[PDB]
Amino acid sequence: MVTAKKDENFSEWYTQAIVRSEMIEYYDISGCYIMRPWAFHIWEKVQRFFDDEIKKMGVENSYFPMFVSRHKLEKGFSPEVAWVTHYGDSPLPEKIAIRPTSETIMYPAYAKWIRSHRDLPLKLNQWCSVVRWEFKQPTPFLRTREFLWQEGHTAHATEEEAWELVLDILELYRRWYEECLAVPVIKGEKSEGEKFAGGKKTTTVEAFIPENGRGIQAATSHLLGTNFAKMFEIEFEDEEGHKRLVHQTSWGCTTRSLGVMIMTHGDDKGLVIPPRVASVQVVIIPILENTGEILGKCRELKTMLEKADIRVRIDDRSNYTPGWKYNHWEVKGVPLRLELGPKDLAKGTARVVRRDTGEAYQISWADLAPKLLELMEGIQRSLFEKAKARLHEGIEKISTFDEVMPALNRKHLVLAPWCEDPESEEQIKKETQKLSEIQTGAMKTLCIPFDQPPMPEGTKCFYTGKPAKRWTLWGRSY
Amino acid sequence: VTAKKDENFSEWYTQAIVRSEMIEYYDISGCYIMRPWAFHIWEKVQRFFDDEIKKMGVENSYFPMFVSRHKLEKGFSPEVAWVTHYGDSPLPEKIAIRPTSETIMYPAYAKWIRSHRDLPLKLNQWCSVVRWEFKQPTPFLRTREFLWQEGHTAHATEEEAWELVLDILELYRRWYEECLAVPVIKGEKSEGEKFAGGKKTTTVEAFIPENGRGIQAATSHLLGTNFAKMFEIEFEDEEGHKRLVHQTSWGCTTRSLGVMIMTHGDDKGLVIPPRVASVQVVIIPILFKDENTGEILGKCRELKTMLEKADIRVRIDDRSNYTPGWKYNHWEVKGVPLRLELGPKDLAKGTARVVRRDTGEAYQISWADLAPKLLELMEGIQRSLFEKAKARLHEGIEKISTFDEVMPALNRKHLVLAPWCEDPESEEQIKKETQKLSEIQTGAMKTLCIPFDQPPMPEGTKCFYTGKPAKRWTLWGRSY
Ligand SMILES: Cc1cc(N2CC[C@@](CO)(C3CC3)C2=O)cc(C(=O)NCc2cc(F)cc(-c3cnn(C)c3)c2)n1
Ligand SMILES: Cc1cc(N2CC[C@@](CO)(C3CC3)C2=O)cc(C(=O)NCc2cc(F)cc(-c3cnn(C)c3)c2)n1
Ligand SMILES: O=C(C[C@H]1NCCC[C@@H]1O)Cn1cnc2cc(Br)c(Cl)cc2c1=O
Ligand SMILES: O=C(C[C@H]1NCCC[C@@H]1O)Cn1cnc2cc(Br)c(Cl)cc2c1=O
């Protein structure tokens, strides 16, 4: 049973929810966690969605090695990578790192494979795990030392084609969150200080966690331009015979998405899993003395529902009371519970309870499959709409810096007109950190949203008083 | 490809996998890049196997890639890769990259399993593992990092665990025979060849005629209660008594792709069985001197739509910057089962010319007949690839009765099926003797498996090596 209340002790609530729902197991190596089937099935669902979509775009999957040579990674202080230095008791002549990302593994191959315009575009993806051995405190799903992800890497003859792909991928990430996970996200461009330094422009989808007021980056898609093509000599002869640099993109999204989903939809009773990704969509709980009447009808119902492609489990485990099973599956977040006891059997009905609201329905056995499909569609949409309402309520539009600290104290983000000077972003981070100290606490840019309201002529930047350029979203962050 | 498969087999294999764009080389020895053309086949067999194990109630999971020194070694270290530093700082205790996940998963199993209500526990994961052997690698077959799936189950009874071992082994037979069209032999490993941590190891074995070697294709172990004792995986039964779980584990890797390549490839390159071909039919418009360009391209689009309506996986190669002859050779070296050519004449005739990759046979087919006729041809290709490979397997196994027949059979690049007493001392002696005789003429012959399909053992039959009473017919040969 979940005892910590989500609004009062959010961090303990999160730990309880992910452990008692059987999503994670702890491990002796800090920063690494076991992903149990209840969570892994959600990853499998989003992976299938995204993989099907990128295949429609002509992206093909591949698999590159998990190791990169020291001289290829460092193309005098090491990055925060895990170094393999020995095989058995024998030192390697040159240490090798576990991939933190695969640019330095893939791009030498791209340089070999690309020789002429005929070879472009080149569009590859891989599903793997990466390792980033940061010394800070980990958080399951959200910030871990090893994590599962997909990384896409493309090369094109023109920047326009590369940018088109950047935006198509970002739209797929919006769909991953909004359509599969029912989590609303905001598409935007990263500031110069926050973008990937190896690239030209970084686009992002950002999510908001109301309980701690923090934004979190949900996925990323980069227009790399020609920087990496210069560094790796990825050149092609054009249709007229001149050597040119390719224009590249890269993009990724991780199991952080599951953590965002958990935090968005969970409640005081535990998880709430959107029907589109739930391992089990309907749990059948026989109200049981096993004559065979009740479980016979349950097996018939499960067969029937599975013909409608509903993911069903009958919980016929012994020595647990019905109420125990009800709470067990509520903590796990199954979106629908189907109760079948003796009175139900006598009437030819079943009692269906939806997890998000607790509303109960008496449904005849015949109406079961269509009514349950309808209810799952309603649950999915209601989860999304309520989360989107909370997102809207969490963003305050401001004009001057003196509004910032009140908004941050309300656990809100701010949308502010900004001159986009990177010096000013560093100054704002320092000032908000120190104001929080006197009163991390730093506010930073989350993104410059694609959806720009008009910028009235003469609008001043909320911090510098210089002419504002764009409306920018700021907040405390992960 | 220019090397002949029947002359320089290793060189043929390297040319086949490079020129088909299946692999790319890499600067760290023993690791290779799996390019999209190879990864497509992997995706097909992964989907088959994952669908089937899900039907059995096995659920996917993901455990960490790292194992602490004290948990792995629960002296001289094993052939694992050791992480010793994060950045410039030494780890307080070094950690290994997984070579397999027993030591990572089983402490969790011990925590999770409390009563019979928790059993059976059936988990699988798709991942890569690392085995840092000092020997020469071979792409797909023997590499230092490789992709695989490892399944690990726990049961209340040995009977249930053994039933699962055999169900999984049958899935591996289907992975090879139904998907890859590679015939395999199910069997039990000898005492000297089985997984030491388990009670009985079952296997599927394939045969490579060009070098006379058996190769283990996949494995499924009855672990019994050994790991349950080691990791304290116990459960309370219905009577309230504490008992040990009965476990299984099982795995299969991208070695399967290399076995497919070696089995079906020919002097022209790869031959992909239709059931694992991401492109089953390639349509090639013959464009020359601007003769009917628009008509030909429109018709190719129509044909692709029609064939896709029949679930045939079709690609039109309308790339303007390659000639038709180049396209012919490209898709042939890549092993696409069927090539469909449509030129000006064919547009006039209402026909298309189709060539099958395995035999080269050509067919003129009316556009209306295309879908059913191509389905029929793909069934024929899949069946023929399997049947020819099975005939080669049959021809490569000699039944023997005495050790004096062994060296002539090995020199014919064959396996031997011999009656054996099953004494491990005798397997060790046979390995040494056959290596020595080979040297005089690696060359050691070992057991590959004791097949499930046992012919009768006539009373009084003597072991082919020791002269003691034979127990079972055993398959032996040179091996990978
Ligand atoms: C699961 C995951 C996802 C992502 N990212 C980033 C990119 C993105 C965006 O969505 C996606 C690929 C594109 C994503 O998912 C980043 C990390 C991560 O930085 N891990 C290392 C680590 C370990 C640790 F023990 C502690 C901390 C730590 C503690 N405090 N701070 C400030 C850091 C960090 N981890
Ligand atoms: C791809 C793959 C698959 C399997 N196995 C084994 C089990 C099985 C059976 O099918 C499946 C999981 C159950 C499978 O696929 C074993 C290896 C492997 O031993 N790698 C290490 C290595 C690296 C290296 F550079 C050289 C050598 C080397 C050279 N000569 N010798 C005698 C060894 C070995 N590799
Ligand atoms: O990983 C990236 C850039 C992009 N790679 C492709 C997938 C999407 C992703 O945003 C940025 N990044 C992030 N963290 C890193 C940590 C280390 Br350690 C190293 Cl060496 C390198 C990096 C590093 O390059
Ligand atoms: O890996 C195994 C046994 C089984 N594990 C589950 C998947 C199927 C597989 O056959 C045997 N094995 C093989 N090679 C190994 C190499 C090293 Br290095 C280590 Cl430490 C351990 C092992 C080791 O245990």
CA dist A55 to A58, A172, A242, B36, B40, Å?
Answer: 5, 12, 31, 12, 11
Measured in Å, residue B283 CA sits from the centre of ligand 1 at 46
Any CB–CB contact under 8 A between B323 and chain A?
A: no
Going along chain A from its start, the domains and CATH numbers come out as 10-265 (3.30.930.10), 282-391 (3.40.50.800), 394-475 (3.30.110.30)
Best CA proximity match to A422, nearest among A248, A194, A196: A194
The rounded distance, in Å, linking the Cα atoms of B191 and B426 is 11
Chain A contacts in chain B segment 26-85 (CB below 8 A): 26-28, 31-36, 39-40, 42-43, 59-68, 71, 76-85
Find the DSSP H helices in A308-450: 322-332, 342-347, 368-393, 404-409, 422-438
Angle between the N-to-C axes of helices A368-393 and A256-265, in degrees from 0 to 180, rounded to the nearest 10: 90
Contact yes or no for A46/A257 (Cβ under 8 A): yes
Helical residues (DSSP H) of A214-307, grouped into ranges: 227-232, 256-265, 293-307
For residue A78, the chain B residues in CB contact (below 8 A) are: 85, 87-88
CA proximity to A266, closest of A221, A365, A332, A360: A332
Q: At a CB cut-off of 8 Å and minimum separation 6, what does A272 contact? A: A265, A266, A333, A335, A355, A356, A383
Name the minimum distance, in Å, from the CA of A63 to any CA of chain B.
Answer: 5
Quick one: chain B helix, strand, coil %, rounded to 5?
A: 35, 30, 35
Instruction: Give me the residues paired with residue B96 across strands.
Output: B67, B82
A149 to chain B, any CB pair closer than 8 A? The answer is no
Question: Per the structure block, which two tokens stand in for A293?
Answer: 């009447």
CB contacts < 8 A, A to B, total 149
Method by which the coordinates were obtained = X-ray
Separation CA B190–CA B450 (nearest Å): 7
C-beta separation of B99 from B129 below 8 A: yes
* Cβ contact B353:B363 at 8 Å: yes
> C-alpha dihedral over B132, B138, B141, B142, to 10 degrees?
-20
Nearest CB among A80, A88, A124 relative to B36 is that of A124
- For residue A446, which of A187, A106, A94, A200 has the smallest C-alpha distance? A187
Rounded Cα gap, residues A92 and A94, in angstroms: 5
Query: How would DSSP label each residue in A111-179?
Result: HHH--BGGG--EEEEEEEEEE---SSPPBTTTB-SEEEEEEEEEEESSHHHHHHHHHHHHHHHHHIIII
Quickly count helices (H) and strands (E) in chain A. 13, 23
Helix axes A256-265, A37-56, angle to 10 degrees: 110
Residue A18 in tokens: 């992910």
**After which residues is chain B discontinuous, taking C to N > 2.5 Å?**
74, 441
Output the CA angle B456-B458-B464, nearest 5 degrees. Answer: 100
CB atoms within 10 A of CB B131: 19
Ligand of minimum distance to the alpha carbon of A88:
4
Distance CA A60, CA B222 (A): 38
Q: Which long-range contacts (CB under 8 A, 24 or more apart) does B198-204 make?
A: B198/B222, B198/B223, B198/B224, B198/B226, B198/B227, B198/B249, B199/B223, B199/B224, B199/B226, B200/B165, B200/B224, B202/B165, B202/B166, B202/B169, B203/B169, B203/B448, B203/B449, B204/B169, B204/B172, B204/B173, B204/B176
Question: SS3 of B435, please?
Answer: helix
Query: How far, in Å, CA of A238 to CA of B26, rounded?
Result: 28
DSSP conformation class of B117: G
Give the CB-side neighbour count of residue B463, counting CA atoms within 13 A. 15
Best of B25, B32, B37, B62 to disrupt the A interface (most A CBs within 10 Å) is B62
Residue from the list A28, A66, A79 with its beta carbon closest to the beta carbon of B87: A79
Query: Which chain A residues contact residue B24 at CB under 8 A?
Result: 109, 112-113
Characterize the bridge pairing of strands A247-254 and A146-156: antiparallel
Report angle CA A327, A276, A39 to the nearest 5 degrees.
Answer: 55
Contacts of A258 in chain B (CB under 8 A): none
* Phi/psi of residue A124, nearest 5 degrees: -125, 155
Q: How is residue B98 annotated by DSSP?
A: P
Q: Which amino acid is at B249?
A: S
Say yes or no for a CB contact (<8 Å) between A65 and B32: yes
Q: How far apart are alpha carbons B340 and A99 in whole angstroms?
A: 42
**Three-point CA angle B14, B15, B17, nearest 5°:** 65
C-alpha dist (Å) from residue A85 to A441, B30, B97, B322: 39, 16, 12, 46
Buried b (16+ CB within 10 A) or exposed e, B165-198: bebbbebbbbbbbbbbbbbbbbbbbbebbbbebb
Q: Which residue blocks in B68-183 are alpha helix, DSSP H?
A: 69-72, 102-112, 158-174
Integer Cα distance of B434 and B432 in angstroms: 6
Residue pair B142/B30 in contact by the 8 Å Cβ criterion: no
Tokens of A180: 């599969």
Token readout for B386 is 């399997």
Residue written as tokens 């060189």?
A: B11
Report the run of H or E that residue B342 belongs to, with start and end.
strand B338-342
**Chain B hits for A44, Cβ within 8 Å:** 60
> Ligand 3 in contact with A154 (CB < 6 A)?
no
Ligand nearest to the CA of A152: 3
Q: Identify whether the C-beta of residue B369 lies closer than 8 Å to the C-beta of residue B307.
A: no
Q: For residue B227, which of B249, B202, B255 has the smallest C-alpha distance?
A: B249
Distance CA B80, CA B132 (A): 6
Closest CA to B205 of B33, B429, B448: B448
Query: Are residues A477 and A194 in contact, defined by beta-carbon separation less than 8 angstroms?
Result: no
Cα of A317 to nearest chain B Cα, Å: 6
Q: Write the DSSP symbol of residue B179.
A: I
